[PDB]
Design an enzyme around this catalytic site. Structure first.
Site, PDB file in Angstrom:
ATOM      1  N   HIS B 101      60.346 115.102  75.875  1.00 29.05           N
ATOM      2  CA  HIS B 101      60.997 113.839  76.296  1.00 29.05           C
ATOM      3  C   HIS B 101      60.719 112.704  75.127  1.00 29.05           C
ATOM      4  O   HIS B 101      60.786 111.707  75.319  1.00 29.05           O
ATOM      5  CB  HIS B 101      60.609 113.122  77.468  1.00 29.05           C
ATOM      6  N   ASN B 174      63.088 113.666  86.649  1.00 31.00           N
ATOM      7  CA  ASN B 174      64.234 114.258  85.870  1.00 31.00           C
ATOM      8  C   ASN B 174      65.480 114.102  86.842  1.00 31.00           C
ATOM      9  O   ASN B 174      65.543 113.591  87.897  1.00 31.00           O
ATOM     10  CB  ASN B 174      64.048 115.444  85.610  1.00 31.00           C
ATOM     11  N   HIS B 365      52.744 108.569  83.835  1.00 26.16           N
ATOM     12  CA  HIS B 365      52.121 109.625  84.281  1.00 26.16           C
ATOM     13  C   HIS B 365      52.375 109.846  85.806  1.00 26.16           C
ATOM     14  O   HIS B 365      51.716 108.818  86.646  1.00 26.16           O
ATOM     15  CB  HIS B 365      50.633 109.475  83.807  1.00 26.16           C
TER      16      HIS B 365
HETATM   17  C1  HDD Z   1      51.465 120.466  82.357  1.00 22.68           C
HETATM   18  C2  HDD Z   1      52.385 120.035  81.612  1.00 22.68           C
HETATM   19  C3  HDD Z   1      53.687 119.347  82.239  1.00 22.68           C
HETATM   20  C4  HDD Z   1      54.549 119.661  83.027  1.00 22.68           C
HETATM   21  C5  HDD Z   1      54.261 121.048  83.816  1.00 22.68           C
HETATM   22  C6  HDD Z   1      55.288 118.699  83.174  1.00 22.68           C
HETATM   23  N1  HDD Z   1      55.362 117.830  82.353  1.00 22.68           N
HETATM   24 FE1  HDD Z   1      56.457 115.988  81.829  1.00 22.68          FE
HETATM   25  N2  HDD Z   1      55.468 115.592  80.579  1.00 22.68           N
HETATM   26  C7  HDD Z   1      54.205 116.069  80.054  1.00 22.68           C
HETATM   27  C8  HDD Z   1      53.878 117.183  80.794  1.00 22.68           C
HETATM   28  C9  HDD Z   1      54.277 117.995  81.590  1.00 22.68           C
HETATM   29  C10 HDD Z   1      53.590 115.240  78.998  1.00 22.68           C
HETATM   30  C11 HDD Z   1      53.306 116.438  77.762  1.00 22.68           C
HETATM   31  O1  HDD Z   1      52.378 114.772  79.371  1.00 22.68           O
HETATM   32  C12 HDD Z   1      54.397 114.348  78.805  1.00 22.68           C
HETATM   33  C13 HDD Z   1      55.191 114.092  77.315  1.00 22.68           C
HETATM   34  C14 HDD Z   1      54.165 112.926  76.581  1.00 22.68           C
HETATM   35  C15 HDD Z   1      53.816 112.315  77.623  1.00 22.68           C
HETATM   36  O2  HDD Z   1      53.608 111.049  77.640  1.00 22.68           O
HETATM   37  O3  HDD Z   1      53.948 113.031  78.675  1.00 22.68           O
HETATM   38  C16 HDD Z   1      55.609 114.420  79.612  1.00 22.68           C
HETATM   39  C17 HDD Z   1      56.770 113.706  79.609  1.00 22.68           C
HETATM   40  C18 HDD Z   1      57.691 113.573  80.758  1.00 22.68           C
HETATM   41  C19 HDD Z   1      58.578 112.570  80.720  1.00 22.68           C
HETATM   42  C20 HDD Z   1      58.719 111.331  79.881  1.00 22.68           C
HETATM   43  C21 HDD Z   1      58.279 110.129  80.263  1.00 22.68           C
HETATM   44  C22 HDD Z   1      58.639 108.891  79.289  1.00 22.68           C
HETATM   45  O4  HDD Z   1      59.725 108.486  79.296  1.00 22.68           O
HETATM   46  O5  HDD Z   1      57.718 108.599  78.436  1.00 22.68           O
HETATM   47  C23 HDD Z   1      59.490 112.742  81.892  1.00 22.68           C
HETATM   48  C24 HDD Z   1      60.515 112.063  82.826  1.00 22.68           C
HETATM   49  C25 HDD Z   1      58.716 114.015  82.577  1.00 22.68           C
HETATM   50  N3  HDD Z   1      57.745 114.466  81.781  1.00 22.68           N
HETATM   51  C26 HDD Z   1      59.029 114.688  83.728  1.00 22.68           C
HETATM   52  C27 HDD Z   1      58.361 115.823  84.176  1.00 22.68           C
HETATM   53  C28 HDD Z   1      59.138 116.650  85.412  1.00 22.68           C
HETATM   54  C29 HDD Z   1      60.223 116.191  86.329  1.00 22.68           C
HETATM   55  C30 HDD Z   1      58.440 117.734  85.362  1.00 22.68           C
HETATM   56  C31 HDD Z   1      58.684 118.899  86.637  1.00 22.68           C
HETATM   57  C32 HDD Z   1      58.698 118.466  87.781  1.00 22.68           C
HETATM   58  C33 HDD Z   1      57.322 117.832  84.346  1.00 22.68           C
HETATM   59  N4  HDD Z   1      57.728 116.706  83.614  1.00 22.68           N
HETATM   60  C34 HDD Z   1      56.516 118.854  84.246  1.00 22.68           C
END
Ligand code: HDD
Ligand code: HDD
Lengths: 726, 726
Positions: B101, B174, B365
């Site tokens: 993202h 999402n 988060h």
């Molecule tokens: C275990 C790892 C992991 C898993 C399984 C998911 N995500 Fe995630 N997501 C992250 C690890 C992550 C992250 C790496 O922690 C991020 C990237 C950098 C951050 O700040 O958070 C992130 C970013 C992130 C953002 C952007 C937030 C922003 O605007 O800064 C959104 C909207 C989502 N995720 C949504 C989801 C949804 C709807 C998931 C499934 C239901 C999902 N993520 C599964």
């Protein structure tokens, strides 16, 4: 196990044309391609086949599909160290991108000089025609992020890391001979103005917005490089088909201590070639990775990018010989006044293994010179020397960035520097200081000398007061923009007009457009009036009477500044779209492919679906891509063989393929009943130059087509394309 | 003074339509738009007007144009602290982008519930219809870097930071109701497969490459969210015209300790609307910032994005009443079985001041919950809770990321945590531990309770062994992809077929295409057959005999899954291109603008040059952009008024404007002699549905056009567009 039984998953370890096979890491695609730097990376290359999947600590993993939980439908447990290690590493994959030139593509290769240059420099890598120096080269844009698109209108970077026997030499240049600004103190101002605007972070990869042209209109020193960016120089066809320049005047230092001023040049053996704007802009959508892809596939095919290194040489006593200041990086040195003298050749012949490890982490810096080279007082270069060391402390996480494998010297290095984050080298020296007696003062200083000597700066005279002041000799802003303008062909001039016009139309505040048009009237009134016309602006009588700037030492033009005025085409490595039908005339396809192969021109067979078609021969033809999947943007010419033309005659995608290519001035060749497509491109029965047509694809049909390709585009078509809806 | 005397450099601080004025930081454009979060940021907002330019230490700078040097043509001096401070800050501007993202656009706003929800949750922000909660919302793509394009085919993120009086609640969702994978342990595998491939870092912002479809073909759990991505859900028209979902089942906890399962929904008040693929892909080239720009300009115009928060609610005793597992994030809960109950409204009504400081640095988060909410054992959510805390340590420089202004709670926060990089808060507590006597144990724990109580986890039962093991109930992969497919209109189904077809044609290894088609045959054989024929693949007899999966609890269709089966588009905030000529019929333009204004529809006046043209009655018309500078991709409909039509009848750009709009199914209206353009789009004399025509733009003309706009696109035109060369 999961691979297909027939082994069609692995690419062959031999040169193959673009799109034939899946691309692959360089060590796997070309294992027999070697050099001393590539070999020295063996200590850190990691395999994979026949190895167990482990943690980073070496522990074999039994189940890489599931987290540890209390019950198979229960909560995940904190004691799952395998999950947490895997997610922790994922969570920290990204590092800061480069402040500028964040978007780039790189490859390995080697350099070799033509003859010894010992008379003018003691630099070891230039001392002997049999001395091979490995290189790592990274090409780039300037403004956009690491995820921005390739074929934007921008300056291009051209950075070469020379792994010499007397240290790393980084030649960090661009694809135009000057820069936008004169003093490094303005670099953050200029870059902030061209970059996405700070409130909303728009636009990406584009100078076509208010703050850029605001700065340009208030800083006429920018106009020279702006002229280059608005020309087709700003949209190259390939990193293989653009020039390189070090921009600044540097020095060469010989064994006797004599200094010669030098400016560095790279000349592409593939010739100079650029896109046109509508094609380049649309290509950022259809394939934002086009240049990265095209470089990688040229190397996999054996179309190794080659560039001749050249020197413009100016004796010390001629420092003040020209109208422009030699140390002013907004001024070029015309090749009509100082020819480029050929020095040697560089060949890029292997792709990296891992993009992040080798490309993203590579660190280039123009302060990395070697004995036999030196700087000058160019005030842009002077400030660059501070920046490239400083910036790596955050981007690469500390001062040990020279220990990252791609950055390592291949020659020995020893000193008394210690510690820092991720310190790899383990020093056994009892001493970490000099002078020391406890290690008999090793490692020791080396006096300067003709070879393997220590670095000593050229003892140039300094005289003046401590001032923040621009040199008055730098205060001329219009003569070089005008010389560049006057050196372009008429169609290149039109493209420059249309570049300014398109960009200024995206500027929301009209007074900025007007102020830029005013600057253009100080350069050339034909240029100014044509841009004004497209903006609905009328020049005033005062503007019409602005005295043009002086010629550059009597020059009315220099043809070396044009992309196309002096022919230097080479079709090898170009690509042709062949539009199929469901019963292709195999005789036509046979003669087409034979002629293309003899000149090293690649082809892609396109249809309206994937899979195969059968020619009238019964020959089975594999389809590379659909008409929409590989638009005419990605190819250099289009050929339509004869066959069942009724199959594609009313196919919208097929007809538009030809119209788009026609609009973008590309050669088109039609055989037999394919000539019926002339109606789609509004070509009269009589034909026209740039459309090859014949009863069949035999005889001189392919010679005509290949002759057009050697000239790149059909410039004479331009008056006809404004009526084409495409 | 460098600003123009007429003050035209400064936008008006009032709502203005897109393109009317330069965009501006939100505090300058809308100073009167306030909320508690925006007010709390005032301590860190920096002005500029009437301030002296200084170093970061407050020292006034006299000459910001030059480095300090020994003589005005001499070397730069190390003692230039002004230069080195300015360049040092520039050199360290970039921070790591988000792992996923990374590309996103954000705005300020507020949320209000419709009714107290105290009966089902003790969450304070849902306790009172008069309680307003400030929000910060970031929309995003998933795959591409921060510099990548907006209108890619991808899942979109929809992240909301609620600054409640009892702590920050981040709803991190999402734009589709399920995710690709079941267990968080596999997230790096899935993300690595979709991201640019590791040898060459290609392709950006696209799932159309080998490694993505390799993983999909081997992990059928991915097929549900893949179906959504291949539909027009993957290419939304605007962040304002898509849905949002929390995906996971969470819990609501009330004051009596009762837990209700809940899934979160956002429903756009502007309705659901998407692009078509050819349009979206071309738009990543013509305007890679289209969604960022459209969001910012809608807010500047008063077209505030609004979304209704809604809950699907399932009592604890109903956990096992469905054909699927509630805790499986690859399964959706059909609205026909569990309706979305309306909860409240969120309005986004002010843009940021500085993209980097507020957008790029924001940290969301899903582990950030408040009393009244809790988690479930959903094994993807369970691993998410680890990642969003961990990843900020590198991305935002350490554990004090909650002190970055945008991330700060607006409610009180006090504890015994101390130190860490860039520590801002200066603690005066004599104690940094508890239990303590020296500060009478302050700050103190708070027992749970109905309001303002401490957080306590719901005491759900855990039973089982420590196992790395997938729940058997998760082992079903085809029935929800089928439910989605069979819920779509026939033209949505065509677009899904064409999505799969386009993407698989970019997969170089053919057996991967074959294995995906085989997976499709387990979902629905009409889909599989249609994709296979575009790939030149023949299904086998055994594949044609695969039994389809059953209905989902009796459902073959759920209407809520289609974008368009029941159109719900508001026309307010949409935009119409008006193609001018040099003597426009003013009576036409009057009727056009009269009708657009009455519906809140914006207009952009286009021509072949910038500046002005004069209508037949003498009205001066300012030109917003050229035909090429603002392509039909960027608008919802096209109108051509009458006038000197000969001026543009032969203009290739004007004719192509209509052909591109026609191909992309947009309404087109032609007045008077402008009906001559029907020939260019191959419309017969008699007319056709979706082309509005009359002798003049009158009352009935504009009603017909706006009725077409209410239906978004002219789906009935699809059978005609394959013959259009555009
Ligand atoms: C275990 C790892 C992991 C898993 C399984 C998911 N995500 Fe995630 N997501 C992250 C690890 C992550 C992250 C790496 O922690 C991020 C990237 C950098 C951050 O700040 O958070 C992130 C970013 C992130 C953002 C952007 C937030 C922003 O605007 O800064 C959104 C909207 C989502 N995720 C949504 C989801 C949804 C709807 C998931 C499934 C239901 C999902 N993520 C599964
Ligand atoms: C004083 C600041 C400053 C100035 C005046 C310049 N640059 Fe620079 N340049 C940098 C500061 C910088 C940098 C911030 O140090 C970069 C960004 C990240 C990095 O490693 O170096 C960089 C990157 C960079 C790269 C990318 C290298 C790579 O691929 O990693 C190239 C090719 C150039 N520059 C070339 C130039 C040229 C031809 C210039 C004018 C003649 C120029 N730069 C002026």
């Amino acid at each position: 196990s999961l691979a297909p039984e027939d082994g069609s998953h692995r690419p062959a370890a031999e040169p193959t044309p673009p799109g034939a096979q899946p691309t692959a890491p360089g060590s796997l695609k070309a294992p027999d391609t070697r050099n001393e730097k590539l070999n020295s990376l063996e200590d850190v290359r990691k395999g994979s086949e026949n190895y167990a999947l482990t943690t980073n600590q070496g522990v074999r993993i039994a189940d890489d599909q599931n987290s540890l939980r209390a019950g198979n439908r229960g909560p995940t447990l904190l004691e799952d160290f395998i999950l947490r290690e895997k997610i922790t590493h994922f969570d920290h994959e990204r590092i800061p991108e480069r402040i500028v030139h964040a978007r780039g593509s790189a490859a390995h290769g080697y350099f070799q000089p033509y003859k010894s240059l010992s008379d003018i420099t003691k630099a070891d890598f230039l001392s002997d025609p049999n001395k091979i120096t490995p290189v790592f080269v990274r090409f780039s844009t300037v403004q956009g992020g690491a995820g921005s698109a390739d074929t934007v209108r921008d300056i291009r970077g051209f950075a070469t890391k020379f792994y010499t026997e007397e240290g790393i030499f980084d030649l960090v240049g661009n694809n135009t001979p000057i820069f936008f600004i004169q003093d490094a103190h303005k670099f953050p101002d200029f870059v902030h103005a061209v970059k996405p605007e700070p409130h909303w972070a728009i636009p990406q990869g584009q100078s076509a917005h208010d703050t850029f042209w605001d700065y340009v209109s208030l800083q006429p020193e920018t106009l020279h490089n702006v002229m280059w960016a608005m020309s087709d120089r700003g949209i190259p066809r390939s990193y293989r088909t653009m020039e390189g320049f070090g921009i600044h005047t540097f020095r060469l230092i010989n064994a006797e201590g004599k200094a010669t001023f030098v400016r560095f040049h790279w000349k592409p053996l593939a010739g100079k070639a650029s896109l046109v704007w509508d094609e380049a802009q649309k290509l950022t959508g259809r394939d934002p990775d086009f240049h990265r892809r095209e470089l990688w596939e040229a190397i996999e095919a054996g179309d190794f990018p080659e560039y001749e290194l050249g020197f413009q040489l100016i004796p010390e006593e001629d420092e003040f010989k020209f109208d422009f200041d030699l140390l002013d990086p907004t001024k070029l040195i015309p090749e009509e006044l100082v020819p480029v003298q050929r020095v040697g050749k560089m060949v890029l012949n292997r792709n990296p293994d891992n993009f992040f490890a080798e490309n993203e982490q590579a660190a280039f810096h123009p302060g990395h010179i070697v004995p036999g080279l030196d700087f000058t007082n160019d005030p842009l270069l002077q400030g660059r020397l501070f920046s490239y060391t400083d910036t790596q402390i955050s981007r690469l996480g500390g001062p040990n960035f020279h220990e990252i494998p791609i950055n390592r010297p291949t020659c020995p290095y020893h000193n008394f520097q210690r510690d820092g984050m991720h310190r790899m080298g383990i020093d056994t020296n009892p001493a970490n200081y000099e002078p020391n007696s406890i290690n008999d003062n090793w490692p020791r200083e080396t006096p300067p000398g003709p070879k393997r000597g220590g670095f000593e700066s050229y003892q140039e005279r300094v005289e003046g007061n401590k001032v923040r002041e621009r040199s008055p000799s730098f205060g001329e802003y219009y003569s070089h923009p005008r010389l560049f303008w006057l050196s372009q062909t008429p169609f290149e001039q039109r493209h420059i007009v249309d570049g300014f016009s398109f960009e200024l139309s995206k500027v929301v505040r009209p007074y900025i457009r007007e102020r830029v048009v005013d600057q253009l009237a100080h350069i050339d009134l034909t240029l100014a009036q044509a841009v004004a016309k497209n903006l609905g602006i009328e020049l005033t009588d005062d503007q019409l009477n602005i005295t043009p700037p002086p010629d550059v030492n009597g020059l009315k033009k220099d043809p070396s500044l044009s992309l196309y005025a002096i022919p230097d085409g080479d079709v090898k490595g170009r690509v042709v779209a062949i539009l199929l039908n469901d019963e292709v005339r195999s005789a036509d396809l046979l003669a087409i492919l034979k002629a293309l192969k003899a000149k090293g021109v690649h082809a892609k067979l396109l249809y309206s679906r994937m899979g195969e078609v059968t020619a009238d021969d019964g020959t089975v033809l594999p389809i590379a891509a659909t008409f929409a999947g590989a638009p005419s943007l990605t190819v250099d010419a289009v050929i339509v063989p004869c066959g069942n033309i009724a199959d594609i005659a009313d196919n919208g995608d097929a007809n538009y393929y030809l119209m788009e290519a026609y609009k973008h001035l590309k050669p088109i060749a039609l055989a037999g009943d394919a000539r019926k497509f002339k109606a789609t491109i509004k070509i009269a029965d009589q034909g026209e130059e740039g459309i090859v047509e014949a009863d069949s694809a035999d005889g001189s049909f392919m010679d005509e087509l290949l002759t057009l390709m050697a000239a790149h585009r059909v410039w004479s078509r331009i008056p006809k394309i404004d009526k084409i809806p495409a």
